[PDB]
Symmetry: C7
């Protein structure tokens, strides 16, 4: 039986990364060779549980990545927002995503840290502008000024191509101790919101000055 | 017994995703073929525990999603609020929900991150408006002005269709060092709160100017 | 023994949600049919541990719910406060609770997220009002004014029915660089605190104006 | 052996909450009746691990409660502070504690959420009052004024019974750009701190006015 | 064998807190008495794992306590700082520590919540005082004033006994838009820092007034 | 069999860090020598599980490090940003990374604490400058001033070598109650952003003074 | 066999901290003495798992400590920064580190709470000083003043020995609504940054006064 067991073990070892495989092979051999390694199994299992609780991140991350990819949630060149960060995606790997912030940095984010993320290149983009006007100014006057500003904006051929449909004037949307707030909304081609917002702000300043609408002004009273 | 064991193993393997299934088959074979793989079982179990702690998120998320669906908590097109985000739901998948923020973004939120979420399309919508008035102004005067404003609002046929029942005047609801606060409440058709609030603010500004109620004013004293 | 084992397995399978039950049955059969599925057990156990770490939330939540119910902590129609949210409870399910915020929203909160929650419909409700008065004003004068205000309040038959017992004047309760603070306390029927607070604030403004008590006023000094 | 095994199983089942006990009995029977339920054991163990990770809270909470009780840390009627909450304890159960906030609410806190909690009814209560005085005022003048205020306080027979020992004047305790801060300390009967603090603040205002000590005053300089 | 097994079980049970011990005894008996309780073992193990995840806190806390005690980190009567709390230690138990805040409260903190804690009664105590002086004042003038203040302080026999060695004048330590900051440092007997700081602040006010050093003053400019 | 077992155990022990290996050897010996150490296995397994939950950090950290290295995410001498810290990398070990803050400190960060980190030496660096201008100033005037400033900047031969391509003027990008904001963008050689930003700010101040553009100015109104 | 088993158990027990060892010995004896303690094993294993989840901290902490020691990250007498704390290291034990804050306290921090820590005694120390100057002042004038200040500083023989190399003037580094900021950088012997910074601030005040550079001044406009 001795020679037979020896031959059996030989055949098995012949049938049998590399260092751990070698340790496991040594374990199976010592097991089959007249030794019952329960506590050696215990030590190797402690080591394996350690590496497990360690090497969990890679797999969690790659599966989160492939899931995000299934939903078509992020492509190369999009403008995404991940937590407190907003930038352009420059490259995606099987572990992490590369986001190029506007301040020049190059953030690397591993998928596990990505729970909820916003994308700016899906369909439409909107603009919600709010402007303040001194509480004492005439409401209709300022509102007509804002309407004239938007109308002049929509005449700019270069910008008109960026707005989908018609503007949406909401009128007054709130009062403060000093000012009331006008609001105008849009619906633009994706990723072009900010250009529209900037042109609108320029036109709004110009026309508020023309129509003589005053900016909000803090008020005091003495004695 | 050798040929018999061989035939048994053959039949079993014949009776026997793909790569892991193949590894498990190799394991059962080496087990039945004169080898006791306890530590090989240990390594494969470490790998499996890793993938487990990894692939937990998908199932947790899908069950959270189906639960949220059971309570009729979220449909396509509703206006929901999830954590620090408020927007419209554009599409729901078996892993995540698509929320369209007003700023044009397209957030993707996986159900696991959704613990508590608010919905604005269930039943009724309310309005609680607060306005400030200088501490020195006559209380009854300002309150009557606000009542006249609300009364003129309720005469606007377009808005009246949005208010359920009658307004609820609360009177003064608090004093500051400079101003006391009036409050009026409503109960409106769902999702129409903001239109009512805006019309009310416009009317309130107009009538506060007519009745000559002053806005709050900071007060100083020199020497 | 072959036919006998076959008959045994048949009887067992005859004696034997649905898909997992079928997989378990296949497992017991392959086990009894000349195969020792230790690693198949390992894979199925990984899957089961995954679903376990997943389907834990439902049971945790239902037991937390039934516990909260045992303590009579929340009923339909009460006005509760859960974390940063305050509203009315509209309906309770075996997984979550429906809270109707005052802003019209309809929050859904699962019991697991509920650790500590306040309820406003248990027994009594109290009012602790603080008012500011310019540092230079006479203490006794302002205090007597506040006492007269409370006295006139207690004469309002409609409100008197809401106050339990007698008011509790505390006198000055703190000094600032500009103002000292008066305080008056109450004990009211449940859920009626705010009506009392509002009536009290109205009366306090009126009587502070009558008695000529000044509001706090920031003070400066030049050069 | 068949009839013998049947009789054995019968006797065992005869020797044998209710639904789980029934499932366990079915398990032991199928085990003893010619079936080896390893994977059925696996499914039942997954379910049990789920309920375990679920029903952990009740026991954790009751043991935390009995521990808090061992240290005599909280009784009915005491004034405790738990996290961001301060109120009176109205009733204690085997799972949670009932705290009555001053604003009328009735918080329910489960012991698990209680890590560190303060109690105001153990032994003594102290008072540390700080008052501000304009930087230009004479130090000795203001300090003597405060001493006279405390002296008049200690003459009030109703309050004297609440102060243990003698006051402790610390003198100036800090400078700002505008004011220096005086401080006086006490040691009072438990739960009576606030009454003493309020009486002291009243006397301090009165005597600061008598002695003509000015409150702090912001200072500017033009051009 | 029946009578023999019965006698064996009897002897064992004879050889055999109380309720759990009884359940375990019942388990060993049913085990030895012709029943293989694997799933009963599973249920009892679920219960035991629950109590384990529950009764972990007591032992964790007592070992953390004995460790803190080994380092001589906290004694009865010391003035410690634990998280956001600062007070005197009144008594220590095998689970928690009793800290007496200055505001009269009596906090109970269990050792587990104590990660990092400061102690004020180990060796020496230091004082780092910063004072502000208007940007336009002469540097040497104010510095000499502060030196004279410290010199007069060191002449107070009662205080001199509390300062170890010599003061350490650092000169200017920073500029603001309005003021530059002088700094003086000390090294005092333990627990006596605040008395020294207060005496120093008194002397500093007196000597800044004598030498005519102005406090910082906000500056404006009109039109 | 006694002598045979003895010889077997001897051979095994002959075939058989050091202290734990010795304990495991003692375990296997006592196991093979007529003793079944199940509870000794339990104690050793508790100890091993402890060390496992302890020695997990080293391996997790080294694998996170080698992963970060695979993505070429951090080299010696780069300027990285890790959480709230921004500095230069001075040396990398198999456990942690050494970051040299600008304030002279030498932070040591272990890879586990590194989830998302930014790098400033990958490709390009950008500049987004915003400047404020009083609301009343002429828009075209200030914009032309800023254009002249940038033009003079691009004439500086030393700086021109640092800017890639052409500046990008966005015009007005927002209104406040007091000021509107101009914006100019760049794209520079990596790590040279700040030099460009500083030169640009100098030129902008000079040219805003030349063209007489006023800085924003708070506005008041009395009575 | 009875006497033989008795002798075997005797020999084993003869071959066989103290209380747990005794319980384990009792377990092995009852095991070998005709009893199969599976559920007793279960209870002892629950207790052991409890102590494990408890006594994990000591080992985690000691290994974190020895790791920090391997990287030469902290010695006796260094000036380190750990989280929100900055002080001198007074002594290190096998569990915790003793940090002496400047305010006299003596913090004890266990290594587990130390994730990222800064050290100020490794190599070099730097200084980055920023000063504000009124927006209307001449840029070249203020910059030349700052250069003269630094030049006079470098003439102080006592300080010159602390600066490595040459100062680095950056010019303007930013504009505000009221002030532009000058910046000068250094590179000093370790731990000597603050002395240099203080001397520099003194010289800067003196020379800004000489050259007549004004501090920033808030600006207003009335009506």
């Amino acid at each position: 039986x001795x020679x037979x067991x020896x031959x059996x073990x030989x055949x098995x070892x012949x049938x049998x990364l590399a260092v751990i495989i070698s340790t496991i092979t040594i374990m199976i051999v010592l097991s089959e060779i007249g030794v019952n390694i329960a506590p050696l199994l215990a030590g190797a299992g402690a080591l394996g549980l350690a590496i497990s609780f360690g090497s969990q991140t890679l797999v969690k991350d790659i599966i989160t990545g492939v899931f995000i990819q299934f939903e078509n949630g992020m492509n190369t060149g999009d403008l995404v927002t991940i937590g407190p960060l907003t930038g352009t995606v420059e490259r995606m790997s099987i572990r992490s995503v590369g986001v190029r912030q506007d301040t020049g940095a190059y953030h690397i984010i591993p998928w596990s840290s990505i729970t909820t993320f916003a994308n700016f290149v899906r369909g439409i983009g909107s603009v919600v502008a709010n402007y303040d006007v001194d509480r004492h100014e005439d409401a209709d006057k300022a509102n007509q000024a804002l309407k004239d500003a938007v109308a002049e904006l929509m005449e700019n051929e270069e910008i008109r191509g960026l707005i989908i449909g018609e503007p949406n004037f909401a009128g007054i949307v709130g009062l403060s101790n000093t000012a009331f707030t006008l609001r105008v909304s849009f619906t633009t081609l994706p990723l072009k919101q900010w250009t529209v917002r900037f042109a609108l702000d320029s036109q709004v300043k110009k026309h508020f000055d023309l129509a003589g609408v005053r900016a909000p002004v803090q008020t005091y009273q003495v004695l």
